[PDB]
């Protein structure tokens with residue numbers, strides 16, 4: 195959206211993508227998108243502090259050919275505005291696995307059946323400080 | 329670019345960019361470009377193992393409106409095909425400072441007078457393993 199945008203990422207199944215960034219002090223939410231391009235996201239990772247009617251909830255969704263799928267909300271919320279947060283992501287043909295700052299990890303279905311992830315983008319509330327490929 | 333491409337970097341003067349990657353085992357050379365966009369580069373970092381008459385020489389240049397500037401060549405070459413390569417680049421108003429693995433540093437004039445670096449791209453011979461911003 196307004197943050198870092200990376201293409202030709204070439205992330206393959208099993209590889210661990212580590213993303214560390216600064217959550218804006220006045221952030222009401224932040225976004226980290228992963229997929230083929232801006233209209234095809236295998237993972238729209240959206241922690242919401244107070245936004246879109248939700249409070250302290252991580253909302254995940256997929257975007258296929260521009261269409262948003264069914265959202266999934268997570269069980270925990272290890273985030274806070276104006277702080278550094280790191281997330282670790284891996285995937286296989288069936289699911290993406292996301293590990294959070296608290297070490298908690300959950301899965302989100304790989305609805306685009308991606309065998310490679312080439313696009314990543316952060317919005318204006320998540321300033322990426324480091325990206326690593328394991 | 330062939331390799332990783334990142335936009336919206338918004339790297340300001342005084343900020344440092346750290347890039348670590350793996351050089352293709354059969355690479356004749358590899359490239360790391362920095363600038364405003366693909367046609368306006370404040371730094372074309374091109375270590376050449378065997379290309380264009382160069383043998384193990386770091387060639388740097390600027391690109392203005394798609395036109396290559398006057399090349400600069402360094403006295404050391406701490407790189408090798410099939411091995412990891414890490415460089416640290418600091419952006420400043422007058423010059424960019426490049427720090428190599430060995431600790432060797434050199435400067436390259438900010439010919440385009442860029443006030444920020446928003447574009448980064450590695451070519452097909454440089455596989456980025458991690459990038460740290462500021």
Ligand SMILES: OC[C@H]1O[C@@H](O[C@H]2[C@H](O)[C@@H](O)[C@H](O)O[C@@H]2CO)[C@H](O)[C@@H](O)[C@H]1O
Nearest residue numbers: 238240246247253254255256262263265
């Ligand atoms: O699904 C991701 C998508 O959600 C939009 O907001 C939704 C909100 O999540 C939902 O609970 C509500 O019922 O409808 C809203 C509008 O469709 C966000 O606006 C969009 O940016 C994405 O985050």
Ligand SMILES: OC[C@H]1O[C@@H](O[C@H]2[C@H](O)[C@@H](O)[C@H](O)O[C@@H]2CO)[C@H](O)[C@@H](O)[C@H]1O
Nearest residue numbers: 372374380381387388389396397398399
């Ligand atoms: O200047 C960077 C640019 O150089 C091109 O090759 C040059 C070569 O370095 C020079 O010695 C010769 O006189 O002209 C060639 C063509 O301009 C590379 O081909 C290009 O990829 C960049 O590396």
